[PDB]
Amino acid sequence: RVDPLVVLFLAVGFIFSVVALHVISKVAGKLF
Template sequence: MSSSAVPGGARTLAKRRNAKDKASSTPNSARSAGANGSSAAMLKLFTDEADGLNVDPLVVLFLSVGFIFSVIALHVIAKITGKLTA
């Protein structure tokens, strides 16, 4: 009879409270876990170190400038050939 606890009562309430505390104390964002994420007035998406294809920031910048210049070059080529054929 005494082996199983009677349902309800103070112990269940305490258990529930504990579970609730635990749920609300696990962090729900990177910053509340102590890492460097979005803050109150700032939206940050990429602040952690994930393992992926590591790239130097300068490489990305040069690639982007290269991409922009290729689009410009296409425009220029189109304009020149357009002038020649027309």
């Protein structure tokens, strides 16, 4: 029992999580 907006929220949240992992990797590499 899932609504469409739930699927869209999951997809955008996952894209956000991947880009966030990339950016935290970059800032950790540049900082130290």
